[PDB]
Design an enzyme around this catalytic site. Structure first.
Site, short mmCIF file in Angstrom:
data_model
loop_
_atom_site.label_atom_id
_atom_site.label_comp_id
_atom_site.label_asym_id
_atom_site.label_seq_id
_atom_site.Cartn_x
_atom_site.Cartn_y
_atom_site.Cartn_z
N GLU A 169 -18.18 11.83 -19.74
CA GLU A 169 -18.60 10.44 -20.01
C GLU A 169 -19.18 9.74 -18.78
O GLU A 169 -20.16 9.01 -18.88
CB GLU A 169 -17.47 9.62 -20.63
CG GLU A 169 -16.92 10.16 -21.99
CD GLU A 169 -17.99 10.37 -23.06
OE1 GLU A 169 -19.05 9.73 -23.04
OE2 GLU A 169 -17.73 11.17 -23.98
N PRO A 189 -34.50 22.61 -33.30
CA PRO A 189 -33.38 22.60 -32.33
C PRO A 189 -33.78 22.86 -30.87
O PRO A 189 -32.99 22.63 -29.95
CB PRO A 189 -32.45 23.71 -32.84
CG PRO A 189 -33.28 24.54 -33.74
CD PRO A 189 -34.37 23.69 -34.29
N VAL A 196 -33.96 17.60 -17.26
CA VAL A 196 -33.51 18.31 -16.06
C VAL A 196 -34.05 19.74 -16.09
O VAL A 196 -33.69 20.55 -16.94
CB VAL A 196 -31.97 18.32 -15.95
CG1 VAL A 196 -31.52 19.13 -14.73
CG2 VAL A 196 -31.43 16.89 -15.83
C1 LIG Z 1 -18.86 13.88 -31.54
C2 LIG Z 1 -18.36 15.25 -31.05
C3 LIG Z 1 -18.04 16.16 -32.24
C4 LIG Z 1 -17.14 15.08 -30.09
N1 LIG Z 1 -17.60 14.61 -28.79
C5 LIG Z 1 -16.97 13.70 -28.05
O1 LIG Z 1 -15.93 13.13 -28.40
C6 LIG Z 1 -17.62 13.38 -26.73
N2 LIG Z 1 -17.85 11.91 -26.64
C7 LIG Z 1 -16.74 13.86 -25.57
C8 LIG Z 1 -16.68 15.38 -25.40
C9 LIG Z 1 -15.58 15.76 -24.41
N3 LIG Z 1 -15.39 17.20 -24.24
C10 LIG Z 1 -14.50 17.73 -23.40
N4 LIG Z 1 -14.39 19.04 -23.29
N5 LIG Z 1 -13.74 16.95 -22.66
C11 LIG Z 1 -16.40 16.40 -29.87
O2 LIG Z 1 -16.65 17.08 -28.87
O3 LIG Z 1 -15.53 16.82 -30.64
CA CA Z 2 -31.92 21.46 -28.34
CA CA Z 3 -33.09 21.10 -19.25
ZN ZN Z 4 -21.57 13.12 -24.33
#
Ligand SMILES: CC(C)[C@H](NC(=O)[C@@H](N)CCCNC(N)=[NH2+])C(=O)O
Ligand code: CA
Ligand code: CA
Ligand code: ZN
Ligand code: CA
Length: 262
Positions: A169, A189, A196
């Site tokens: 985040e 996709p 980047v």
């Molecule tokens: C919306 C998706 C499915 C969800 N993602 C989050 O909640 C995202 N804002 C944070 C991901 C954090 N990942 C981690 N390994 N600490 C999800 O990933 O389920």
């Molecule tokens: Ca993509």
């Molecule tokens: Ca890239």
């Molecule tokens: Zn994110």
């Protein structure tokens, strides 16, 4: 030589049940993780495939719980607010006292981190956290993380118990985008970019922890950089930022978040 940019953090704990009023140790543990991840001091950086060792970045950012409040008075840098609200959403209810949350401290001087028990997306998915990118209103600037995905002790639970939701985040807070490009369901996709160059073009988010290589969008033989903090893999599986991402973070610090510079 790196200018180490030191970001004052205020953690707004917003709690309904007592167990949600997370410990000082749990909060500190998260700060400690940020200070490893954003300095390339995480031991698990060793997990990065050797082909990409050269790309691993030290972002040169450190974090501390604020020692002065917005009016220059001593503080712990932690606010604790009881609420009758049982869940919060991406609509920012957690960020206003009036909606059962806690108001932001001035976003030009502090990174606001809100911690609450339950977060839902606009479609009702349970989510772990969300950020506001640079340039948005100060009132809602910062990051929100659920307590069970915050820190490395206390209420934190695997597989989100290594502090990486906050690393991810705060990545967004510093103007980094999801490595796969955030295509909508009807889009090709392989069509969107994270802006980047050194992050390989990638189809979709990766979850859990893929085996290397995980190829997509003709990015073989090396495949997706799924161990980048801007993917969606489990905490123990994401362990690096790239130098190309550091360039974007640097632009953020030099421009919209220049108020944090010494
Ligand atoms: C919306 C998706 C499915 C969800 N993602 C989050 O909640 C995202 N804002 C944070 C991901 C954090 N990942 C981690 N390994 N600490 C999800 O990933 O389920
Ligand atoms: Ca993509
Ligand atoms: Ca890239
Ligand atoms: Zn994110
Ligand atoms: Ca909003």
């Amino acid at each position: 030589r790196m200018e180490i940019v030191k970001i004052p953090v205020v953690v707004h704990v917003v709690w309904n049940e007592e167990e949600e009023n997370i410990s000082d140790a749990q909060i500190q543990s998260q700060i400690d993780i940020l200070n490893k991840d954003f300095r390339k001091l995480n031991s698990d950086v060793s997990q990065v495939p050797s082909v990409w060792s050269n790309l691993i970045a030290d972002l040169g950012i450190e974090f501390f719980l604020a020692t002065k409040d917005p009016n220059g008075n001593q503080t712990t840098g932690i606010t604790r607010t009881q609420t009758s609200v049982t869940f919060f959403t991406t609509s920012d209810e957690v960020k206003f006292a009036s909606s059962g949350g806690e108001d932001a401290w001035p976003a030009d001087r502090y990174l606001n981190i809100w911690v609450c028990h339950v977060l839902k997306s606009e479609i009702g998915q349970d989510i772990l956290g969300y950020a506001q990118f640079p340039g948005g209103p100060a009132e809602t600037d910062g990051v929100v993380i659920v307590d069970a995905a915050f820190g490395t002790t206390g209420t934190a639970l695997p597989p989100f118990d290594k502090g990486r939701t906050a690393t991810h985040e705060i990545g967004h807070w510093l103007n980094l985008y999801h490595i796969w490009g955030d295509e909508l369901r009807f889009e090709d996709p392989c069509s969107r970019s994270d802006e980047v160059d050194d992050t390989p073009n990638q189809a979709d988010p990766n979850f859990g922890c893929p085996s290397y290589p995980h190829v997509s969008c003709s990015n073989g033989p090396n495949g997706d950089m799924f161990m980048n903090y801007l993917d969606y893999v489990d905490d123990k599986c994401m362990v690096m930022f790239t130098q190309g991402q550091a360039t974007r973070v640097n632009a953020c610090l030099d421009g919209p978040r220049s108020s944090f510079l010494a």
